[PDB]
Amino acid sequence: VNSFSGYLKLTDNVYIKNADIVEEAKKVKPTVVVNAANVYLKHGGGVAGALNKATNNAMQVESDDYIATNGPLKVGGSCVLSGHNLAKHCLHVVGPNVNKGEDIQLLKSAYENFNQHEVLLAPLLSAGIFGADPIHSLRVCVDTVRTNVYLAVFDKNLYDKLVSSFL
Numbered sequence: 001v002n003s004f005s006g007y008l009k010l011t012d013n014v015y016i017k018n019a020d021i022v023e024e025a026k027k028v029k030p031t032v033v034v035n036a037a038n039v040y041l042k043h044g045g046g047v048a049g050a051l052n053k054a055t056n057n058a059m060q061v062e063s064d065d066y067i068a069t070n071g072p073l074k075v076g077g078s079c080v081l082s083g084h085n086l087a088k089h090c091l092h093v094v095g096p097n098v099n100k101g102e103d104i105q106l107l108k109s110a111y112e113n114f115n116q117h118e119v120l121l122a123p124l125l126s127a128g129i130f131g132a133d134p135i136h137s138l139r140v141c142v143d144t145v146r147t148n149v150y151l152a153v154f155d156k157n158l159y160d161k162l163v164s165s166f167l
């Protein structure tokens, strides 16, 4: 038993809710919140900009030190950093950004990072400003992640569509 509430169960291990991931994180305080990161951990907009804003820019300060030490992430890769006031940990995962021409097949590699964590609160990778089809992203999530994932979808219209088209 865990503290996630109002989710619709899609599969054995994948759940989905129309929710603002920032507000869901602040309420649940999950062990892991997933950020929709880029390779530079520049949290300017989308989910990343919202998560970082909610930490009063502490996420960005920590991220800049991480990059100065380690260099950029790989597309499809991840790193674990602090969850600040939102979660114990933040798993920064880089989905391919279609608006940069990145290979969509890397979306499966991105979701594989979730399997290193027993339970996660996450957005749909490569959705939103990353330019992928959220329905494809949901399919890859379901077919790749084996651990327990609670998907927060900000847009109510999109949430309903994703549900109504789910196979």
Ligand SMILES: O=C(O)[C@@]1(F)CN(c2cc(Nc3ccccc3)ncn2)CC12CCC2
Binding pocket: 019, 020, 021, 022, 036, 045, 046, 047, 048, 049, 050, 051, 123, 124, 125, 126, 127, 128, 129, 130, 152, 153, 154
């Ligand atoms: O749809 C997009 O463009 C996105 F940038 C934003 N989406 C969100 C967004 C969210 N809260 C939120 C984020 C920013 C402002 C207000 C609320 N909570 C969950 N998902 C997923 C996405 C990141 C990858 C695709």
